[PDB]
């Protein structure tokens, strides 16, 4: 049977988990935000000339799905823990929620920490809106330190919108398994 990888994507609502998956697998970007309960993407990649099936599992960022979400975790090979680079609350939830939940169910599964919406970090309006609430975007060093703190294999930054660093996220997930 063709070699297969199950990758599960978790993180707060609105961080960009669904756009990450749509943009990576089809190069499209959806025009309207519809909250995810569960969704799936089956895609083939060539890894050193051999086909690999990527089973990508999308999950709900909302607290109301906390009891169902872990039921999708069995047989996971790698987790993507996602936070938005322009949402400090979503960053803090990596330590307060996502890392503890993933580790409770899957103590030995590799984690990639993913900073999303890279395109917004330099956006003056986004910066000013954060600044008005005494906040600042998450910097690369901050993300890196959080990755070290939670034992993540790798810290990566990307934009689903521009596709900057997007392919690298999934390539690194593959490398964490194969």
């Amino acid at each position: 049977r063709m070699q297969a990888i199950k990758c599960v994507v978790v993180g707060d609502g609105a961080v960009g988990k669904t756009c990450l998956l749509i943009s990576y697998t089809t190069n499209a970007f959806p025009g309207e935000y519809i909250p995810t309960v569960f969704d799936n993407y089956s895609a083939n990649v060539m890894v050193d000339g051999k086909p690999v099936n990527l089973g990508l599992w999308d999950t709900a960022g909302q607290e109301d799905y906390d009891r169902l979400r872990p039921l999708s975790y069995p047989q996971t090979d790698v987790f993507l823990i996602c936070f938005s680079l322009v949402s400090p609350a979503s960053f803090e939830n990596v330590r307060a929620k996502w890392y503890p939940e993933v580790r409770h169910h899957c103590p030995n599964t590799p984690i990639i920490l993913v900073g999303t919406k890279l395109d917004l970090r330099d956006d003056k309006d986004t910066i000013e809106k954060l600044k008005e609430k005494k906040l600042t975007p998450i910097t690369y060093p901050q993300g890196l330190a959080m990755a070290k703190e939670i034992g993540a294999v790798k810290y990566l930054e990307c934009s689903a919108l521009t596709q900057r660093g997007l392919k690298t996220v999934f390539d690194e997930a593959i490398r964490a398994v194969l």
């Binding site: 669904t18 998956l21 749509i22 990576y24 697998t25 089809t26 499209a28 959806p30 569960f38 969704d39 799936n40 993407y41 089956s42 895609a43 083939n44 990649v45 060539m46 890894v47 050193d48 000339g49 099936n53 990527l54 999308d58 392919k167 999934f170 390539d171 593959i174 490398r175 194969l178």
Partner: peptide, 22 residues
Amino acid sequence: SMEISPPVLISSSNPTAAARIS
């Protein structure tokens, strides 16, 4: 040192993505 190709979507439960297949 790994050569990884872009993905080819085979299937999805997601309406937006499934529409862009094959």
